[PDB]
Design a protein around this ligand. Structure first.
Ligand SMILES: *C(=O)[C@H]([C@H](C)O)[C@@H]1N=C(C(=O)O)[C@H]([C@H]2CCCO2)S1
Length: 443
């Protein structure tokens, strides 16, 4: 049909009027595919059902013990809550509030409490090589400024001398350079890589080669140990506010009764965060939300497995969607383990459309011609459907997925799932132009 794009590519496609019993287009709709960021559609629905639009992430400073003459006889607890939007200034402000409450001194330990979550901060099936990139920063219980920092790498004046790293003193990381500066001619330039090697306690070593360059190379990396990073920031703010402590910084991972909350920060409401997540394909909001869903549903520390089980259960029991053999490994779609058929994603989209007056969901999706990842998508623009499609992209090396809704020329809303992979821009554009033009004009 319209099928003629590259032969190496795999298309599974389903298009169906909202509320109809049969699809208008059905091409290999039962075939399971990698959803990439369209996984976020499922995460958003399950989140709204389990947590509600008004859920907020919460971070607190708590005291366990008596305060005598400005001395806490006991521990300060910083209880992190996986808030993906927490900033350095929020820590500073909670510390200011702690001081204001009359605590000048802690005769005890400072505990960094991450007990909200347990097990690894990285989902099964995430590629190891992207773990130092900010887009794949481990979505830990302890996040400050997205657990991303930047660094400037300078080549040495003398070839053979070590390239050197500048980093802002406000990042509690430890950088080492083993990078050799190459002369502009070097035979080494072709196959000598420039690499980052993370170590314990937020140490990073840069290795390999860098050709002489006139300006520094800017680099941004993901924090691997969020609890230590957040601890170091808290320790700095305590010291600056003149609060001393006699113990040490310790991680608290086991569930425990809360102390007296002396300071707190709540995120924006979940509906607002889910909107950012869908409009910008924000992996960190997606994946903090995902482990939070499991924690909320089962009253256990949030893990990837509990998140997966909970989302499956929510879809089946609340949304009437049995996802069968679907694999849900995370919230963002980062995992190469995620596997779902258009027919299953369609049941999710139909539920959303049928309940949209309740969920206010469709307004959160990128709107073609306006925003999100659809501000300008050549295929949709050329199909004449700007303003008519609200959809989530899933875009990877060779993957061009779209999942969402289109209003046709006759005013009917059709749901659609386009799972297209192994693509290797003209052919995609020609395919989407034709396909969406057809859907819009002929329905
Ligand atoms: C969704 O398909 C992916 C996630 C990571 O699986 C997200 N969306 C993209 C995009 O191209 O829209 C993201 C880009 C931003 C920088 C590199 O990844 S990740």
């Amino acid at each position: 049909y319209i099928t003629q794009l590259p032969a190496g590519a795999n298309l599974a496609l389903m298009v169906q009027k909202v509320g109809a019993s049969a699809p208008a287009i059905d091409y290999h709709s039962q075939q399971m595919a990698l959803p990439a960021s369209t996984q976020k559609v499922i995460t958003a629905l399950a989140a709204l059902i389990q947590l509600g639009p008004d859920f907020r992430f919460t971070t607190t400073l708590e005291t366990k013990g008596n305060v005598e003459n400005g001395v806490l006889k006991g521990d300060l607890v910083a209880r992190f809550g996986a808030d993906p939007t927490l900033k350095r200034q929020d820590i500073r402000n909670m510390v200011a509030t702690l001081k204001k409450s009359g605590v000048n001194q802690i005769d005890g330990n400072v505990l960094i409490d991450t007990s909200i979550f347990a097990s690894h901060d990285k989902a099964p099936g995430w590629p190891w090589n992207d773990m130092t990139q900010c887009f794949s920063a481990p979505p830990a219980a302890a996040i400050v400024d997205r657990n991303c920092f930047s660094v400037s790498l300078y080549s040495a004046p003398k070839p053979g001398d070590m390239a050197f790293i500048r980093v802002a003193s406000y990042y509690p990381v430890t950088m080492f350079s083993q990078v050799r500066t190459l002369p502009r001619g070097s035979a080494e330039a072709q196959y000598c890589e420039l690499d980052v090697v993370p170590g314990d306690l937020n140490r990073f070593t840069l290795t390999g080669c860098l050709p002489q360059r006139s300006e520094p190379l800017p680099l941004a990396f993901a924090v691997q140990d969020g609890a230590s990073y957040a601890g170091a920031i808290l320790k700095y703010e305590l010291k600056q506010a003149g609060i001393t402590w006699s113990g040490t910084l310790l991680r608290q991972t086991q569930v425990n009764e809360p102390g007296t909350v002396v300071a707190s920060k709540q995120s924006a409401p979940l509906h607002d965060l889910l909107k950012i997540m869908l409009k910008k394909s924000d992996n960190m909001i997606a994946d903090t939300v995902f482990r939070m869903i499991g924690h909320a549903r089962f009253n256990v520390p949030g893990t990837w497995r509990a998140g997966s089980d909970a989302v499956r259960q929510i879809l089946r029991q609340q949304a009437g969607v049995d996802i069968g053999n679907t694999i849900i490994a995370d919230g963002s779609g980062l995992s190469r383990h995620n596997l779902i058929a258009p027919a299953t994603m369609m049941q999710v989209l139909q539920y959303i459309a049928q309940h949209d007056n309740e969920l206010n969901f469709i307004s959160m999706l990128p709107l073609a011609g306006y925003d999100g990842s659809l501000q300008y998508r050549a295929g949709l623009h050329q199909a004449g459907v700007d303003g008519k499609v609200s959809a989530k992209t899933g875009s990877l090396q060779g993957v061009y997925n779209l999942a969402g809704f289109i209003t046709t020329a006759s005013g009917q809303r059709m749901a659609f799932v386009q799972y297209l992979s192994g693509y290797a821009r003209i052919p995609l554009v020609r395919f989407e132009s034709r396909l969406y033009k057809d859907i819009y004009q002929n329905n």
